[PDB]
Scaffold this motif. Sequence first.
Motif, PDB file in Angstrom:
ATOM      1  N   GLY A  75       0.415  -1.272  -0.232  1.00 26.19           N
ATOM      2  CA  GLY A  75       0.374   0.091  -0.327  1.00 26.19           C
ATOM      3  C   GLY A  75       0.772   1.519   0.208  1.00 26.19           C
ATOM      4  O   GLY A  75       1.831   1.140  -0.162  1.00 26.19           O
ATOM      5  N   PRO A  76       0.891   2.213   0.064  1.00 29.65           N
ATOM      6  CA  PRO A  76       1.228   3.927  -0.055  1.00 29.65           C
ATOM      7  C   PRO A  76       2.158   4.055   0.785  1.00 29.65           C
ATOM      8  O   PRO A  76       1.539   3.199   2.099  1.00 29.65           O
ATOM      9  CB  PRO A  76      -0.086   4.572   0.189  1.00 29.65           C
ATOM     10  CG  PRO A  76      -1.500   3.908   0.601  1.00 29.65           C
ATOM     11  CD  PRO A  76      -1.294   2.385   0.189  1.00 29.65           C
ATOM     12  N   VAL A  77       3.101   4.527   0.475  1.00 26.24           N
ATOM     13  CA  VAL A  77       4.245   4.839   2.456  1.00 26.24           C
ATOM     14  C   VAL A  77       3.664   6.231   2.433  1.00 26.24           C
ATOM     15  O   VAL A  77       4.000   7.092   1.749  1.00 26.24           O
ATOM     16  CB  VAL A  77       5.439   4.971   1.475  1.00 26.24           C
ATOM     17  CG1 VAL A  77       6.454   4.920   2.364  1.00 26.24           C
ATOM     18  CG2 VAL A  77       5.675   3.692   1.409  1.00 26.24           C
ATOM     19  N   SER A  78       3.524   5.798   3.723  1.00 30.95           N
ATOM     20  CA  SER A  78       3.062   7.458   4.675  1.00 30.95           C
ATOM     21  C   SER A  78       4.580   8.512   5.191  1.00 30.95           C
ATOM     22  O   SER A  78       4.446   7.440   6.138  1.00 30.95           O
ATOM     23  CB  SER A  78       2.050   7.335   5.215  1.00 30.95           C
ATOM     24  OG  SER A  78       1.586   8.812   6.095  1.00 30.95           O
ATOM     25  N   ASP A  79       5.410   8.643   4.105  1.00 34.70           N
ATOM     26  CA  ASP A  79       6.764   9.618   4.960  1.00 34.70           C
ATOM     27  C   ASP A  79       6.585  10.698   5.580  1.00 34.70           C
ATOM     28  O   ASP A  79       6.907  10.563   7.047  1.00 34.70           O
ATOM     29  CB  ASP A  79       7.439  10.912   3.598  1.00 34.70           C
ATOM     30  CG  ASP A  79       7.540   9.912   2.549  1.00 34.70           C
ATOM     31  OD1 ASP A  79       7.624   8.743   2.643  1.00 34.70           O
ATOM     32  OD2 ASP A  79       6.852   9.881   1.597  1.00 34.70           O
ATOM     33  N   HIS A  80       5.254  11.512   6.212  1.00 36.28           N
ATOM     34  CA  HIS A  80       4.934  11.620   7.176  1.00 36.28           C
ATOM     35  C   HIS A  80       4.648  10.975   8.851  1.00 36.28           C
ATOM     36  O   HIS A  80       5.881  11.504   9.291  1.00 36.28           O
ATOM     37  CB  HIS A  80       2.823  12.576   7.028  1.00 36.28           C
ATOM     38  CG  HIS A  80       2.959  13.707   5.706  1.00 36.28           C
ATOM     39  ND1 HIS A  80       2.708  12.866   4.167  1.00 36.28           N
ATOM     40  CD2 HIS A  80       3.855  14.627   4.980  1.00 36.28           C
ATOM     41  CE1 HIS A  80       3.050  13.955   3.605  1.00 36.28           C
ATOM     42  NE2 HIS A  80       3.798  14.844   3.968  1.00 36.28           N
ATOM     43  N   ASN A 103       7.173  22.428   1.619  1.00 29.31           N
ATOM     44  CA  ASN A 103       5.185  21.741   2.395  1.00 29.31           C
ATOM     45  C   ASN A 103       5.448  20.989   1.689  1.00 29.31           C
ATOM     46  O   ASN A 103       5.086  19.742   2.342  1.00 29.31           O
ATOM     47  CB  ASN A 103       4.456  22.713   1.307  1.00 29.31           C
ATOM     48  CG  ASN A 103       3.955  23.400   2.084  1.00 29.31           C
ATOM     49  OD1 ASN A 103       3.863  23.968   3.332  1.00 29.31           O
ATOM     50  ND2 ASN A 103       3.750  25.456   1.443  1.00 29.31           N
ATOM     51  N   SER A 104       6.288  19.897   0.718  1.00 31.47           N
ATOM     52  CA  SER A 104       6.433  18.510   0.245  1.00 31.47           C
ATOM     53  C   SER A 104       6.802  17.584   0.799  1.00 31.47           C
ATOM     54  O   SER A 104       6.386  16.391   1.513  1.00 31.47           O
ATOM     55  CB  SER A 104       6.782  18.379  -1.801  1.00 31.47           C
ATOM     56  OG  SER A 104       5.717  19.257  -2.447  1.00 31.47           O
ATOM     57  N   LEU A 105       8.173  18.067   1.749  1.00 24.53           N
ATOM     58  CA  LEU A 105       8.602  17.324   2.476  1.00 24.53           C
ATOM     59  C   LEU A 105       7.897  17.195   3.778  1.00 24.53           C
ATOM     60  O   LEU A 105       7.025  18.170   4.023  1.00 24.53           O
ATOM     61  CB  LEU A 105      10.356  17.932   2.537  1.00 24.53           C
ATOM     62  CG  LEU A 105      11.110  17.298   3.751  1.00 24.53           C
ATOM     63  CD1 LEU A 105      11.344  15.417   3.503  1.00 24.53           C
ATOM     64  CD2 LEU A 105      12.556  17.981   3.841  1.00 24.53           C
ATOM     65  N   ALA A 114       9.053   0.269  21.686  1.00 27.84           N
ATOM     66  CA  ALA A 114       9.393  -0.127  20.270  1.00 27.84           C
ATOM     67  C   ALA A 114       9.307   0.716  19.880  1.00 27.84           C
ATOM     68  O   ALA A 114      10.234   1.449  18.766  1.00 27.84           O
ATOM     69  CB  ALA A 114       7.867  -1.201  19.980  1.00 27.84           C
ATOM     70  N   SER A 115       8.707   2.021  19.715  1.00 20.66           N
ATOM     71  CA  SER A 115       8.387   3.706  19.229  1.00 20.66           C
ATOM     72  C   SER A 115       7.693   4.850  19.891  1.00 20.66           C
ATOM     73  O   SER A 115       7.179   3.976  20.306  1.00 20.66           O
ATOM     74  CB  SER A 115       8.273   3.577  17.778  1.00 20.66           C
ATOM     75  OG  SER A 115       6.631   3.457  17.676  1.00 20.66           O
ATOM     76  N   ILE A 116       7.802   5.782  19.320  1.00 24.61           N
ATOM     77  CA  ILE A 116       7.485   7.211  19.473  1.00 24.61           C
ATOM     78  C   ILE A 116       7.207   7.811  18.602  1.00 24.61           C
ATOM     79  O   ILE A 116       8.209   8.251  17.722  1.00 24.61           O
ATOM     80  CB  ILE A 116       8.722   7.864  20.460  1.00 24.61           C
ATOM     81  CG1 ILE A 116       8.879   7.085  22.001  1.00 24.61           C
ATOM     82  CG2 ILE A 116       7.587   9.034  21.050  1.00 24.61           C
ATOM     83  CD1 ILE A 116       8.953   7.737  23.372  1.00 24.61           C
ATOM     84  N   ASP A 117       5.867   7.981  17.903  1.00 25.10           N
ATOM     85  CA  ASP A 117       5.463   9.132  17.066  1.00 25.10           C
ATOM     86  C   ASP A 117       4.400  10.150  17.424  1.00 25.10           C
ATOM     87  O   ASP A 117       3.999  10.051  18.801  1.00 25.10           O
ATOM     88  CB  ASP A 117       4.551   7.637  15.969  1.00 25.10           C
ATOM     89  CG  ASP A 117       4.539   6.578  16.270  1.00 25.10           C
ATOM     90  OD1 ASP A 117       4.537   6.117  17.599  1.00 25.10           O
ATOM     91  OD2 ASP A 117       2.847   6.497  15.808  1.00 25.10           O
ATOM     92  N   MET A 118       4.591  10.921  16.070  1.00 24.66           N
ATOM     93  CA  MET A 118       3.571  11.966  16.669  1.00 24.66           C
ATOM     94  C   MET A 118       3.580  12.677  17.699  1.00 24.66           C
ATOM     95  O   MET A 118       2.829  12.973  18.528  1.00 24.66           O
ATOM     96  CB  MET A 118       2.450  11.691  16.817  1.00 24.66           C
ATOM     97  CG  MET A 118       2.082  11.048  15.127  1.00 24.66           C
ATOM     98  SD  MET A 118       0.405  10.381  14.945  1.00 24.66           S
ATOM     99  CE  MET A 118      -0.297  12.399  14.385  1.00 24.66           C
ATOM    100  N   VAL A 119       4.697  13.319  18.354  1.00 20.73           N
ATOM    101  CA  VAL A 119       5.008  14.120  19.305  1.00 20.73           C
ATOM    102  C   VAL A 119       3.880  15.907  18.829  1.00 20.73           C
ATOM    103  O   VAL A 119       4.470  16.334  18.094  1.00 20.73           O
ATOM    104  CB  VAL A 119       6.162  14.335  19.916  1.00 20.73           C
ATOM    105  CG1 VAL A 119       6.471  15.016  20.824  1.00 20.73           C
ATOM    106  CG2 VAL A 119       7.030  13.449  20.104  1.00 20.73           C
ATOM    107  N   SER A 120       3.266  16.079  19.321  1.00 20.15           N
ATOM    108  CA  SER A 120       2.055  16.884  18.680  1.00 20.15           C
ATOM    109  C   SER A 120       2.317  17.869  19.521  1.00 20.15           C
ATOM    110  O   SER A 120       1.415  17.456  20.557  1.00 20.15           O
ATOM    111  CB  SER A 120       0.787  16.382  18.501  1.00 20.15           C
ATOM    112  OG  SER A 120       0.196  17.629  17.933  1.00 20.15           O
TER     113      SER A 120
END
Lengths: 345, 343, 330, 334, 334
Positions: free
Chosen positions: A40-45, A264-266, E38-44
Motif C-alpha cells: 500500500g501507500p507509504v506515508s513519509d509523514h 511543504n512537500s517534504l 517499540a517506538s515513539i511517534d506523533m509528538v504533537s
Amino acid sequence: TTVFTRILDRLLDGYDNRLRPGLGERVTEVKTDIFVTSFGPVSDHDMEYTIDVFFRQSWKDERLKFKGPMTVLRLNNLMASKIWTPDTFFHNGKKSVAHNMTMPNKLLRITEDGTLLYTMRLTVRAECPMHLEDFPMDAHACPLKFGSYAYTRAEVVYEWTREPARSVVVAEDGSRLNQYDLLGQTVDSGIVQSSTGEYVVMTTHFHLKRKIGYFVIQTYLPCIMTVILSQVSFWLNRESVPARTVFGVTTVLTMTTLSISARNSLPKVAYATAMDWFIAVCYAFVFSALIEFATVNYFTKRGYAWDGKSKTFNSVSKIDRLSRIAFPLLFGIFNLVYWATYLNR
Amino acid sequence: TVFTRILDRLLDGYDNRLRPGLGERVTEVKTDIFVTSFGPVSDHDMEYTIDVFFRQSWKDERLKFKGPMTVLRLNNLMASKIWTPDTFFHNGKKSVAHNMTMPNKLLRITEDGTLLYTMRLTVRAECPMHLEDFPMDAHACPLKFGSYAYTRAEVVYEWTREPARSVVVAEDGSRLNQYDLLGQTVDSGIVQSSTGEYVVMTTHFHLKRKIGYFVIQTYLPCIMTVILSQVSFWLNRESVPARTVFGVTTVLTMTTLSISARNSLPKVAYATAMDWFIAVCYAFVFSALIEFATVNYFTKRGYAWDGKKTFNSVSKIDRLSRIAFPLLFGIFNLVYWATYLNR
Amino acid sequence: DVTVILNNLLEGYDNKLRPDIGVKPTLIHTDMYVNSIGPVNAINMEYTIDIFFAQTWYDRRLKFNSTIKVLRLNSNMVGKIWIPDTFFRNSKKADAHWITTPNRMLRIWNDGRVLYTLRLTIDAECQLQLHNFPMDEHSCPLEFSSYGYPREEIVYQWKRSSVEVGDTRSWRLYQFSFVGLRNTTEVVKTTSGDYVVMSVYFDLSRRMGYFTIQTYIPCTLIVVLSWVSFWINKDAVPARTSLGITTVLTMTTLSTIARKSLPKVSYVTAMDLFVSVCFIFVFSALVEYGTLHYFVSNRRIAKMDSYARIFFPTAFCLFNLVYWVSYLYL
Amino acid sequence: SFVKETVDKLLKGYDIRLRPDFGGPPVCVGMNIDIASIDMVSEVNMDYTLTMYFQQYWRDKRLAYSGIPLNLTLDNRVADQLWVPDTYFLNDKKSFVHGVTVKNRMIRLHPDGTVLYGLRITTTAACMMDLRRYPLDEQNCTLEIESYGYTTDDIEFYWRGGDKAVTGVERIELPQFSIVEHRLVSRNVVFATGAYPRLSLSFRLKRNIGYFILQTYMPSILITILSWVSFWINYDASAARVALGITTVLTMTTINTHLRETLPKIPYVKAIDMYLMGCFVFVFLALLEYAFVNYIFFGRGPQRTDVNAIDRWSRIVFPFTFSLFNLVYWLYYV
Amino acid sequence: NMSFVKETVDKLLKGYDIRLRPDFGGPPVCVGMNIDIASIDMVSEVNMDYTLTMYFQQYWRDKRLAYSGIPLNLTLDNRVADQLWVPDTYFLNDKKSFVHGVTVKNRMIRLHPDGTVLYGLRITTTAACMMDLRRYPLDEQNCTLEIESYGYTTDDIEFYWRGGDKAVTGVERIELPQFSIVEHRLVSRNVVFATGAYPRLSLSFRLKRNIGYFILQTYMPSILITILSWVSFWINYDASAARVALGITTVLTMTTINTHLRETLPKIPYVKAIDMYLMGCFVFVFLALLEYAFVNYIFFGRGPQDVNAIDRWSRIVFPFTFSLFNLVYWLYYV
Ligand SMILES: *[C@@H]1O[C@H](CO)[C@@H](O[C@@H]2O[C@H](CO)[C@@H](O[C@@H]3O[C@H](CO[C@H]4O[C@H](CO[C@H]5O[C@H](CO)[C@@H](O)[C@H](O)[C@@H]5O)[C@@H](O)[C@H](O[C@H]5O[C@H](CO)[C@@H](O)[C@H](O)[C@@H]5O)[C@@H]4O)[C@@H](O)[C@H](O[C@H]4O[C@H](CO)[C@@H](O)[C@H](O)[C@@H]4O[C@H]4O[C@H](CO)[C@@H](O)[C@H](O)[C@@H]4O[C@H]4O[C@H](CO)[C@@H](O)[C@H](O)[C@@H]4O)[C@@H]3O)[C@H](O)[C@H]2NC(C)=O)[C@H](O)[C@H]1NC(C)=O
Ligand SMILES: *[C@@H]1O[C@H](CO)[C@@H](O[C@@H]2O[C@H](CO)[C@@H](O[C@@H]3O[C@H](CO[C@H]4O[C@H](CO)[C@@H](O)[C@H](O[C@H]5O[C@H](CO)[C@@H](O)[C@H](O)[C@@H]5O)[C@@H]4O)[C@@H](O)[C@H](O[C@H]4O[C@H](CO)[C@@H](O)[C@H](O)[C@@H]4O)[C@@H]3O)[C@H](O)[C@H]2NC(C)=O)[C@H](O)[C@H]1NC(C)=O
Ligand SMILES: *[C@@H]1O[C@H](CO)[C@@H](O[C@@H]2O[C@H](CO)[C@@H](O[C@@H]3O[C@H](CO[C@H]4O[C@H](CO)[C@@H](O)[C@H](O[C@H]5O[C@H](CO)[C@@H](O)[C@H](O)[C@@H]5O)[C@@H]4O)[C@@H](O)[C@H](O[C@H]4O[C@H](CO)[C@@H](O)[C@H](O)[C@@H]4O)[C@@H]3O)[C@H](O)[C@H]2NC(C)=O)[C@H](O)[C@H]1NC(C)=O
Ligand SMILES: CCCCCCCC(=O)OC[C@H](COP(=O)(O)O[C@@H]1[C@H](O)[C@H](O)[C@@H](OP(=O)(O)O)[C@H](OP(=O)(O)O)[C@H]1O)OC(=O)CCCCCCC
Ligand SMILES: CCCCCCCC(=O)OC[C@H](COP(=O)(O)O[C@@H]1[C@H](O)[C@H](O)[C@@H](OP(=O)(O)O)[C@H](OP(=O)(O)O)[C@H]1O)OC(=O)CCCCCCC
Ligand SMILES: *[C@@H]1O[C@H](CO)[C@@H](O)[C@H](O)[C@H]1NC(C)=O
Ligand SMILES: [Cl-]
Ligand SMILES: [Cl-]
Ligand SMILES: [Cl-]
C-alpha cells in the motif's frame, strides 16, 4: 454427512487450547508463507506503510488427528477459536486489521495426520523509519517483522514454507506506490534477545527508491532558472538602477516563494535535507547577485546611459564583467558537486 | 473466606432492571467531579476535551451485608450485574471510558448498602461559540449531565458538597493553549422534554482568549502596513514610479496579511472583529493610493527640485493627507479597541 | 412484584418475530428531537446531527395486568424484546452513545404500548447544489425506514409533534443559518420490496458576511485601483506598468480563496464568475496601456485613456448590476 | 403462534457448520448490489469509498416451511444462527456494516427454502490509478467478490438479473468525476489448487475538466500573454519591461505554488505539471528576451545588429510557439 | 510429557478466585514493571500529546499459581489472563490507548514454578504532556508517563521498577522526526492523600528539538532580507524608484516569510521565540524603508527652506543595532 459431523463433534474432546502442541516434548515448528496482495501507500509523514497480505501458518497438532473418508477438514470460525493457534504478531506493526467482511476472512484446515493450515487476510500498517537526509534522492528498506509474542525459541520456532526468497510473493499489480519504486525484497530470519527471553523473528525488507522526476520539474528546475534569472541582471547596463533593483528583490521574493513551496512537500522534520541545501545555496546566489549590483551602483558616476546616436559615458563595470563569468561558473561547479554527491551513491 | 461468602450472597435475589427503592422513594445520586485535565479546546469544531474522575454515590438497600469487613470492592464482572445510574452528558459528542489496562472503573459498597461508583472518562463535549468578538472573545463552555431514562420523579441528582466545591479542577492540569481558565460555575436545575422532566447538573467553565499572539501576528503587521502607506505622503510628487510602487505593494502586502489572518480563524461565515479591523486597514491602504492618483493629476512638470526655473509646489492634498490619514486611523483605533476590550 | 411482571412478559417470547407478523402491518409512531445540527462539510457533502430518536408501537405480547400502569426501564431490556430495524438511508456513518451507560430508554405500558428512545449522532450525506455560491440555499434531508420489513410489515407515521428542536443558538452551524424544516412521507420501491420512508428536510441558507469583506470588497478595490493608470500620464511607463502587473499579482493572490472550503466542482459558482471577471478587468487594464503605449510611441487611437476612463467603470458597474440582481432577486 | 412453532422447528437441528446441499451440487449464490453512493475517490491513497445494499440469494432446503403463504422476514440476529456464504471483497481496504439503530442486515425466508441475505456495507476499495494524464485522466476502479474457503465445487456466484444486478450507478453524482459506464463480470479463477468463483463490478470514472480550466489552465495562459506585452514596450523603458517580466515570473510561481498546495500530492510528473513548467519557461524566455535586447544596445552598440529586429521577431514567434505548444499538448492528451 | 502439564494447569485454576489479590489478608503484593519502548511517534505540540508503543510487563508472585514437578516456565495461551488476577494498572495522562490484536491479542501470561506471574502487554498509548513552547524552536520538553493503581492503595499493592534503572529499554533506539531524546528517568514515589498513599511509577523523557530546519528555513532567509534592506543606504538619495522598490519588496518578502511559516508551523497561538525574531526583522525592514522617507523629505520638503549624513549614519547604526538584537536574542534563549 453424519460421518462428517461426527468428526467435528469429537475432535475437541479433552483438547486444551491453553497448551501449545508438544508442550514438554518438542518445539512447535510453524511454517509461514506470505502473499502480498498489495504494497500500500507509504506515508513519509507518519513514517509508515500499509500492506495487504494473505498470512499462512502451517503447524502440527497430534491431538487433532482424525480417521474417515475425507483427508482434510474445514473448521468454522467458532471451532477455529477453540484450537491453539500461534500468537504471531508484527514487531513493527502499528495498527493492523483482520478483515471480517462479510464473514471472518480466515480459514483453518485440519489434515488427517494432524497438520493444520491456518490462513488469514490482513491489512498491516507497519512503521518504516526513514533517514530523509538525501531527500529527494533517498532509498529505503521498509521492514516487516513478525514472530511469537509469548513463546520463546525453545517453545515455538518459525520457518518459511519454501526457500525464503520464494516464501514472500508480491502480486503483479501489488505496487500501489505513487512516490516510490519497489525494487524487490529480501527475506531473512533471525533471533532477538528480549527481557523475557529469545524469540525467533521472520524479517522481510522491501527496498524502495524515491522517484526524482517530480522534484526536478517542481523544485530544482524553477530554482535553477530563478538563479539564472538573477545572474541575467549582470548583462543589463549599470545605469538601469530601478530595473536592476526590482530585478534583484523580485528574484529574492521568487526564491522565497519556491523555498516554502518545496518545503511543504517534504514531511515536517527539523533537520536539513539535500533539497534544503540546494535551495539555501540558490538563496545565497540570488542574494549575492543583488549585493553585486549594490557594489556596481556605488561606483557608477553618470546618471544617463549610453545613447544610440553616439559627452562622456560610463564604462562597463569590471565587477559586472567578472560576475558575468564567476557567478555562472560557481553555480555550475555547485551543481556538478551537488548532483555527484547524492546521485553517485 | 468470609469475604468470598458475602460476595456470593450479595446478588442473590437481585434484579438490576429495577432502580433501588422503586415504588417507595426517588433515587438520590450524589455526584462529584475531579477534573484531572481540562483538555484542548477546538475552535474549528466548537468542542472541548476534559479528563475527569466522575463519581456517583447512592444507596441500594438490597445490597446491605453483615460481616467483619466494612467496605466491599466489586470487580467489573459483578459491577455490571448491579443497577447503576444511567448518567449521560447532554452536550457530549464522543466520550471515552478508558479500558487500559483494565476498565478504569471502581464500584465500592459500604456496609449499610451505600454504593460509591467512580470512573475515569475523557468527555468530548460541545461548546457553542459566538466569535463575533474574535480574537477578543470570552466563552462559557458548559458540561451538562443527568439521567437518560429516569425522570425527576425516579432519580434525582445532587452535588455531594456545595456546588462550587463539588467540581475540583486539578491545579497543574489546564492544558489550554489559547485560553485562560478563569473559573467554573456550578449549578443544577430541571429540564422539560416530551418524555417528562429531568434533573440536570451543569458546570460552566469560563475561558478568556489570549490576545498576545494576535497582536504580534496580525494587528501589529497590519498597523505598520497602514503607516507605510501614509509614509508615501512625504515623498515628493514628482517620483511617480516610487509612489505608485509604494501604494500597490502595500495593498499586496495587506492582501497577503488579510488571507493569512483569516486562515487562522475557524471557517465561520460571519464577520468577526479581526475581519473589520483588516477591512478598515484595507480601506486606508486603498485610499492612500487613491490620494496619490489625485495628487499626480495636478502635477505640472516632470522634474523635481534640485540641489540649487519654476518648480512644483508641495501638494495641498499631500499636506492635508499627512494629517487626515494618521488622525483618522488613530481615531479608528481608539474606537476599535475601546469597543472590544472594555466588554 | 415488578420482578414477577418482567419475568412473565418474556416467558414464551420470541424477539425474532414482528408483532402481528401474519395479521397486519406494525404501525410505528416516530418522534425526533434535534439536539444540534453539526457543521456542514461541503467537501464531503455531508452534515452532522445529534437527535433523540423515539419510536412508539404496540406489542400485544407485552400486555400485563397489574396496578402498575407503566414500566420505566433502562436499556438492558432493549435486546430482549422485538425492536424495529429502523435505519437512516442517507447516513454515511452513525453511532449511538454509551457513556456512562447506553443512552437508551424503554417504557412499556399495560396495554402493550412500547416507547423506545435512543440518542444518535448521524453524519448524513447531503448533495449540495453549489451554484450561486456563496448565495446558495440547501435542504439537507434525513431519511429513515425499516431495513427488512416492507410496507406490508412495518408502517411509519409521524406524531402530532414530529420534530422538535432546541434553541438553535447552541448548534454548530458555521457557514449556514437554519431557515426552516419540513417532514414528508413516501413509499420507495427496491428489489426487496416497497418500503415506507420518513424524511426530514432542514433548509439552510449560507451566511454571506465573510465573503463580502474577505473576497468581494477586496476584489472590487483591486479593479478600481487598476483604473488609476487611466489617469496617470502615458509617458510614465514604469508607473503604469508596475501598477498594472501588480494588481494582476494581487488578483491572482485573491483568486486562490474563491474555491477553498468547497469541493472541486467543475461548474462556475457565483464566486468564481465574479473573481474571473475581476481578473479580466485588471488583465484588460494592463493590455489597455500596452496598446496605448505601442501606438502612441512605437507607431481614436491616441484617445484610448479618455475612452477607458468611462468605459471601464461603466462596464464594471453594468456587470455588477446584472450579477447582483441575478443571484439575489432572480 | 403457528408461525412461532414453525420457525422453532426450522432452527432446531440446523447445523451452521454445513452448507446447503453439503454432500451434493454446489450451492448457487446470486448477488444483487444497490449502490447508495460513491465518495472519497483518493488519488493519494489510490482507493475509493462506496456504500451499497449487498444482497445474496441462495436456496437451503432445510429452511423450507409449508402452510404459511408469507415470506418470513425475521430479526437480523437470526442470521448468526444460519449458514451464509463466506463472501469477501478482494480489493477491500476497510469495510463495516452499518449498525444504527440496529445492524443493517436482513434475513427473509421463503417457502421453498430461499434465503435473502441483505447487508448495507460501506467499503473502501483499492484500485491502482494511472495519473500520468491528470487532470485529463480516466480511471477504471473495480470491486472484486470472492469466496474465501469454498471452491467452485461447493459454491457458485452469478449476477441475479444478469445485466441489471447492479442498480443506482446512474444516479451517482461525483463532483470531480462522471461515470462513463460500468460492467458486471462473472468468471472462475482457475488455479492448480482449485477453481474459485469471482464476481467483478467495475466503473470507468472520467475526471471533469471544467474545474482545471478555470483554476489552472486559464490563469496560466493569461499570464503568458501578459509576458508578451513587453515586446511592444520600447526597449529604452528598462524599468517597465524588467518589472513586467519579473512580476509575471513571480505571478507564474504563485500559481504553481498555489496548485501544489490545493491539488492532491501525487509525487510524479503529470500532464498538468508539463503545462505549468511549459508556461513557466515561456515567461522565463520573455524576460530573457529583453536582456538580449538591452545587451545588444548598451553592451555592443558602442563597439559596433538591430535592436528593433529582436522585438519584432519576438512578437510573432512567442505567440506562435505557445499555440504550437498548446496544439501539441492538447492533441497528446485529448 | 504433556499430560502432567494439562493436569497441573487445570489443577491450578480449580479453586482459584479471580476477585482476590495474592495475599489478600497479608502484606501488599509487590508488582515489578518493565517497559520496552517499540517506538515513539506523533509528538504533537498542538494537541500537547505524544504516542508511544511499548511492551509493558508486570511481575508478581501468586502463591496460588505455584506448581512443582515441572522444571519449565509454563507459557500459556493469552486468553488465560481472563481467568487470573491482574493488577488494575492504568496511566493517568493516557488520552487513548489499546492493546494490539493482530493476529491475536498481544498479551502474554507466563507462570513460574515458585508462583511468579509474568503478564506482558503490547500497548500503544497516546499520553498527554504539557509543553512550554515559549522558547520554541529552542525548547526542551519533558514528557512523562504516570503509572498507578486505580483502586488499590499502598497497603494492598506496591509498584517498583524491576531490576533498577535499567527497567526501561529501547530508549536509545527511539528516533523522532524533529526531536532528540536527551535522557530518560525512572521515578518510584507514593502519592500520599488523606485516604491513603497510592503507589506510582513515573517514566519521563527529555526531548530536545532539532534546529537544522529552522536555521536554513526561518532564521537564515530573515537575516538575508534584513541585510538586503540595508542596500538602500548605499543607493543615491534621489533614486526614489529604486530605493522604494527595494524597501517595500523586502517588507513584502518578510511578510511572505512570516505568513507562510504560520501556515507550515504547528498552530500554537501564543508568543514564541520564533515570533519575536520574525517581528524584530520586520521592524528593521520597516525602519529601513522609513529611513528613506526621512531622507527624501529632508531633501525635498525642508530642502528649499544634509541628506548625505542620514545615509552615512544609517550604514553603521542598522548593521550595529541588528547585530546587538541578535546578541540579545541568542543570549536570552540560548
Ligand atoms: C468484525 O469484527 C468486529 C470486532 O469484533 C465487529 O465489531 C463488533 O461488533 C459487535 C456487533 O455490533 C459489537 O458487539 C456489540 O456491541 C454493543 C455496543 O457496545 C460496544 O461498542 C461500543 C461502540 O463501539 C463502536 O465502535 C466499534 C469499533 O471501534 C464498533 O464495532 C461498534 O459497533 C460501535 O460503532 C463501545 O462503546 C462499547 O464499549 C463500552 O461498553 C463496554 C461494555 O459493553 C465496556 O466494556 C467498554 O469499556 C465501553 O464502556 C462496546 O465495545 C454491545 O452493546 C453489545 O452487547 C450487547 O448485545 C450482545 C448481543 O449478543 C449481548 O451479548 C450483550 O450482553 C449486550 O446485551 C446486553 O446489554 C444491552 C445493553 O445494555 C441490552 O440492551 C441487552 O438487553 C443485554 O442486556 C442483557 O444482558 C446484560 C448483561 O450482558 C444484563 O445486565 C441485562 O439484564 C440483560 O440480561 C455487543 O457487545 C462489538 O462491540 C464490536 N467490537 C468491536 C471491537 O468493534 C464487527 O461487527 C465485525 N463485522 C462483521 C461483519 O462480522
Ligand atoms: C476494468 O478493468 C478490468 C480488468 O481489465 C476489466 O475486466 C475485464 O473485462 C473484460 C470485458 O468484459 C473481461 O473479458 C470478458 O470475460 C468474460 C468472462 O470470461 C470468463 O468466463 C468465460 C465463460 O465462458 C470463459 O470462457 C473465460 O475464459 C476465457 O477468457 C479468459 C480470460 O478472461 C482466458 O483466461 C481463458 O483461457 C478463456 O479464453 C473466462 O473464464 C467473457 O465472457 C467475455 O467474452 C466476450 O468477448 C469474447 C471475445 O472473444 C467473445 O467471444 C464473447 O462472446 C464475449 O463477448 C470477455 O472475455 C475480463 O475477463 C475482465 N477481467 C477482469 C480481471 O475482471 C473491466 O471490464 C474494466 N472496466 C471497464 C468499465 O472497462
Ligand atoms: C520531568 O519533570 C518531572 C517533575 O519535575 C521530573 O520528575 C522528578 O524527577 C526527580 C529526579 O530528577 C525526582 O526527585 C527524586 O525523587 C525521588 C522520589 O521521591 C519520593 O520518594 C522519596 C522517598 O524515596 C520521598 O522522600 C519524596 O518526598 C519528597 O517530595 C515530597 C513531595 O510532597 C516532599 O514532601 C518531601 O519532603 C520530599 O522532598 C518522594 O515521595 C527521591 O527519592 C529522590 O531523592 C534523591 O535526592 C535527594 C535530595 O533531593 C536525596 O536525599 C536522595 O538520597 C536521592 O538522591 C529525588 O528527590 C522527583 O521526585 C520527580 N518528580 C516527579 C513529580 O516525578 C522528571 O525527572 C523530569 N524529566 C526529566 C527527563 O528530567
Ligand atoms: C559580490 C562581489 C563584490 C566585489 C567588490 C569589489 C569592490 C572593488 O574593488 O571595487 C573597485 C572596482 C570598481 O570597478 P568598476 O568597474 O565597478 O567601476 C570603475 C572604477 O570605479 C574605476 O576606478 C573608474 O575609473 P576612473 O578611475 O574614475 O577613471 C570607472 O569609471 P568610468 O570609466 O565608469 O567613468 C568605474 O566604472 O572593482 C574592480 O576593480 C573589480 C574587482 C574584482 C571584483 C570581482 C567581483 C566578482
Ligand atoms: C483624497 C483626496 C481627494 C481630493 C479631491 C479634490 C482634489 C482637488 O480639487 O485638487 C485641487 C487642489 C490641488 O492641490 P495641489 O497642491 O496638489 O495642486 C496645486 C494647485 O492645483 C494649485 O492651484 C496650482 O497652482 P496655480 O494656481 O496653477 O499656479 C499648483 O501648481 P504649481 O504652482 O505647483 O505648479 C498645484 O501644484 O487640491 C485642493 O484644493 C485640496 C482640497 C482639499 C483636499 C483634502 C484631502 C484630504
Ligand atoms: C409531519 O409532522 C406533523 C406534525 O407531527 C404531522 O401532523 C404530519 O402528518 C407529518 N407529515 C407531513 C407530511 O406533514
Ligand atoms: Cl506511496
Ligand atoms: Cl485551546
Ligand atoms: Cl456549517
